C-alpha cells in the first residue's frame, strides 16, 4: 500500500517516500468566525469565537470551549441566565465588559415534600400571556418567462426547450 | 477594500464602515447594518 | 341491551414513547466544499450569485431551529426542582428514573441505558456545531421536571410548585381518570408493587428489544448518510475530465480548464443544494416531532391529559420524561382495566313511581341484588338518595327495573 | 499485488511452463487451476 | 472456485471499512478449469480479461507462464520464468 | 416571516445581477454584441443559472409555506380550543390554568391574549388521605383534608377555603384498618342537630 483512504473518498494516511513510514494526514484546522456583540448601543467591545478549532494557533483573553475558542471575553465561574448563545453550555455582557460563563438552567429550588404535608394556595393571580402566531405570508407571484428571459423572444425559444 | 456606505435621503454619503477594520465592522458589513443587535453573528471563515 | 362489563381489578402499565427533538447541527462552507483552496474556482463561483450565502444561511437557520427545538421541549420549567434526599413516596419507587449520584453523569439508570444503546469526524468544509444545551444540562432539565411532577404533581407546570404527598397526588390523578380516590388508598400497596414491577419491566424491555430507540437512531443515521453522500459526491466527475480540482487545473490551460472547472462547480453546487433541501425537509420533520414532544411534555408530564392514546394506551395517570441523544423518551404510566365481570344493568331504578339515575357510575346487578358502582372499578354500593338523583317518573324511561332506594334519613 | 510492469503489448493467449522430471518425460503430480476474470 | 480469486483492487489502504468496487474478479463458486501436470499437461488457454492461476504442488512443477497473441517468433511475447535462480 | 420573505425576494432579484458564467449578466447586452451561434450558448448558461435560482427560491418558499401552514394549523387549533372554548390541556393556551383567551389580528398573524389563573400565596397544611370516624373511613368527595394544627377542614385543592368535615362533602368507603395514613377526627353529621 502507498496511501490510505477514509470511509469517505478522502486520504487519511500516506506511506512517506525517502523513509518508508506512515504519515497521518489531518485536514489542517479551519472553522467559522462568530462575533459576540452586546449591541452597538450597549458597547462597541466585541469578542471573537473561532468555531470548532483549537487556538494554541491563531490573544488578550482566551477561553477554549467545545465550540472553539473565545477571544476578548473573560470566563467567569459564577453562572448566569444565558444572554448570548455560544454553544457547548457556554453563554456570554456585564460590568461594561463581555463575560463567558456556563449557562444557568434557572433558580434551583427544592419543594418541601412530606408524606403528610400539602401546600394549598390561599390566593390567585389572573395573568394574561401574549402568544404570537404567524398565519400567512406575502402572496408573491413570479412569472418565469418575464423573470429569467427579459423582454426577448430568443431566450423564450431557448426556454421552451426546457 | 469593501466599504458599507450610508447614503442619506439626498444621496450624500454620511457614514462608512470598513469591512476589514475590526470584527465589529465585519459584523456590521455581514448584517448590512450600521447598528447590530445583541447576539452571535458568523461573519467569516478562518482557514489555516 | 341490559348487560355491562365492569372491571373488578386494574393494572398500572408504563409505556415508552420515543420522540426525536433535534438533529446534529451540521454546517457546510459552500466556498470551501465546492471550490477547494483554489482562487480560480472561487472567481467562477462568484459569477453564480449569492447561492453560497443562501445555502449557509439555510443551514444556520436549521441549526438555530434545532437549538430552539431542544430549548422548547426541555426548558418548560422556570425553576430547577430537586427531589428530596429521602425517597418516602408511599411505596412508589423511582430509582430507575431518578438521577443516580454514583454515576459520574447525573443520569438515571434508564436514560443511561438509552445513551448506551444508541451508537453514533472531521471533513473538508463540514463542521458539527455542538448543541447549545449539553447532555448533562438536558439530563438536569429532565431530572428537574421529574422531581417537579413527583413532588408537586401538575401544579409546578401551572405555577408555583406546591408540595403534595405522592399517594395523594396519585389519588387526585385516579379521581381525574374517573376512579374514586378510595380505590388507590385501599390498594396502595398493590399499585406501588405494580408500578415498581412495570418500571423494572420497561427498563428490561428497553435493554432487551432492539429498534426501541430506532426512531432516534434513524435521524442520526439519515444525517450521517446525507453527510457521507455529500462527501462522496466530491469524488464524482459530473462530466468533468477528473473529480479532483487540482488535477484538472494543473493539466489544462485556464481558457480550456474553465469549462471543466465549471462542470465540477455546477455539479458540486447542485449536490450541495440537494443536500441543503434534504436537510431542510428533514429539519421540518424533526421540528414537527419536537413540537409534538413539547406538547406531550406540557400535557402528559406537566399535567394529566384526558386525550385518549395521546400519552400512551389506557387511561393516562402520569408521564416521566427521560433525556436521550437528540431525543426524549416519555415513560407514560397509565391505568388499564385488568379483570372484567358481566353485570345485569338497568338505566334507572323505579322506586315508589319515581325514576332514579346514578349521580356517578352505573347500576349493576350481580344476579340477586342491585348496586351502584363506578364504571372503571367494581365497588358495589347500596342504592341510596345521596348517590342517585330522581328525574321524572317510571313511565317515560325505557327498560328500567324496580328496586328499593334506601333513604339514609329514614332509619 | 507482487509485480506491476508497463509491458504495453496485448495478451490474448496464455500458456503455463512446467518442470519436466526426467525418468522420456514424466511430470510431477500437481494441480494447476485456471479461472477467467469477469467484470 | 469457492471464495478464491479476490485480490487487493488498488494500493489504497482501508481500515475496518467495507468497500464496494467493480473490477475484473473471479466470480465466487465459479467453475475453474483444473489440470494435472502428470500424464498416466500444459494446453494453451486464451487470456481474455484476466487469469487466476492456482497451483497445488510440492516439487514446483509449474515454473513459469507465457503470455502473447500468437505465441511464436512472429510476434512480441511476454515470458515469466523461474529457472531456480530468479523470476525473469 | 416578513423579513425572510423580503430577504428571499431580495436574493431572487439580486441573482439576476449574477453572470452564471456569461460574459455579462444583462441578457440583451450579451445578445446585442454576440452572433446567434455563440449568443445562444451564453443565453443557455444564463437561463440555466436563473432557472436554477428560481427553482431554489420556489423550493425555499414551499418549505417556508409548509412551516407557515403548520403555524396556521396550530393557530386555528388554539383559536378553537382556547378562544371558542376552554382548554384543559396544560400550556396549550398559556402558563397556568386556562380561563379564556382573546384573539387580536396582526399583519400576517394572530396574537392570542390568554387569560389564565395562577395559584399564589400558598400555605403549608398537615394533610391526611382519609379520616377515621366511628370505625368508618371518610375520603373527601371533592377537595382534600387539611389541618392548620388545631382543626381539620375540607378544601378545594386549587384554593384554600376551610370547611368543617361533614357527611355531604365526604364519602365513606371500607374501614379504618385498610387505609394507610388514616387519622382520627369527628365527621359532623348535619342530621345530628
Ligand atoms: C488543543 O490544544 C491543547 C493544548 O495544547 C491540547 O491539550 C489539545 O489536545 C488540543 N486539542 C486538539 C483537538 O487539537
Ligand atoms: C390576594 O392578592 C391580591 C393581589 O393580587 C390582594 O389584593 C388580595 O388582598 C389578596 N387576598 C388575600 C385573601 O390575601
Ligand atoms: C437635503 O436637501 C434638502 C433640500 O430640499 C434640505 O432641506 C435638507 O436639509 C437636506 N438634508 C440632508 C440630510 O442633507
Ligand atoms: C388484581 O390484580 C393484581 C395483579 O394481577 C393482583 O395482584 C391482585 O391480587 C388482584 N386483586 C384482586 C382484588 O383481584
Ligand atoms: C427501588 O428499586 C431498586 C432496585 O435495585 C432498589 O435498589 C431500591 O432499594 C428500591 N427503592 C426502594 C425505596 O425500595
Ligand atoms: C360474560 O363474560 C364473558 C367474558 O368474561 C363472556 O364470554 C360472556 O359472553 C358473558 N356473558 C354474558 C351473558 O354477559
Ligand atoms: C350477589 O350480591 C348479594 C348481595 O351482596 C350476595 O348476597 C350474593 O351472594 C351475590 N350473588 C352472586 C351470584 O354473586
Ligand atoms: C332488552 O331486549 C329484550 C328482548 O331481547 C327485552 O325483553 C328487554 O325488555 C330489553 N331490555 C331493555 C333494558 O331494553
Ligand atoms: C314496577 O312497579 C310498577 C308499579 O309500581 C309495575 O307496574 C311494574 O310492572 C313493576 N315492574 C317490575 C319490573 O317489577
Ligand atoms: C412549608 O414548610 C417548609 C419547611 O418547614 C418550608 O421549606 C416551605 O417553604 C413551607 N411552605 C409554605 C408554603 O409555607
Ligand atoms: C385553625 O383554624 C381554626 C378554625 O376555627 C381556629 O380555631 C384555630 O385558631 C386555627 N389555628 C391556627 C394555629 O391558626
Ligand atoms: C409518614 O412517615 C412517617 C415516618 O417518616 C410516619 O411516622 C408517618 O406515619 C407517615 N405518615 C403517612 C401519612 O404516611
Ligand atoms: C385512632 O383510633 C384507633 C382506635 O379508635 C386507634 O387504634 C388508633 O391508634 C388511632 N389513630 C390515631 C392516628 O390516633
Residue numbers in the entry:
A (entry chain B): 563 to 620, 639 to 672, 687 to 756
B (entry chain B): 273 to 320
C (entry chain A): 709 to 828, 853 to 1143
D (entry chain A): 225 to 247, 257 to 272
E (entry chain A): 31 to 70, 80 to 127
F (entry chain B): 951 to 1143
Tell me what the authors wrote about this structure, in their words:
We determined the cryo-EM structures of CeSPIACE complexed with spike ectodomain trimers whose RBDs were BA.2 or BA.5-type. The EM map showed that CeSPIACE binds to each RBD of the trimer, forcing three RBDs into an open conformation, although in the prefusion state, the trimer is predominantly in a single RBD open conformation. Two spike trimers formed a head-to-head complex mediated by CeSPIACE involving several docking modes. A typical docking complex occurred when the CeSPIACE-RBD binding restricted the orientation of a head-to-head complex, thereby twisting the overall architecture and distorting the trimer symmetry. Two spike trimers docked via CeSPIACE dimers at two of the sites but via a stack of multiple peptides at the third site. Conformational restriction induced by dimer-mediated binding at two sites created a wider space between the third pair of the opposing RBDs, and two peptide dimers and an additional peptide filled the resulting space (arrow). Most particles consisted of the docking complex linked at all three sites, suggesting that triple-linked complexes are more stable than single- or double-linked complexes, which have wobbly sites. The crystal structures and peak retention time in gel filtration indicated that CeSPIACE certainly dimerized in physiologic solutions, but the cryo-EM structures suggested that CeSPIACE has stacking properties that allow it to dock two spikes. Head-to-head complexes similar to the cryo-EM structures would form on the viral envelope, implying that CeSPIACE can bridge separate spikes to aggregate viral particles.
The spike protein of the SARS-CoV-2 binds to human angiotensin-converting enzyme 2 (ACE2) through the receptor-binding domain (RBD) and changes the conformation to fuse the viral and cell membranes, mediating viral entry. Here, we used a structure-guided strategy to engineer an inhibitor peptide with mutation-tolerant and potent binding ability against all SARS-CoV-2 variants. We named the peptide CeSPIACE (COVID-19 eliminative Short-Peptide Inhibiting ACE2 binding). For engineering, we determined approximately 2 Å-resolution crystal structures of CeSPIACE or its intermediate-stage peptides complexed with the RBDs of several strains, including WT, Alpha, Delta, BA.2, BA.5, or XBB.1.5.
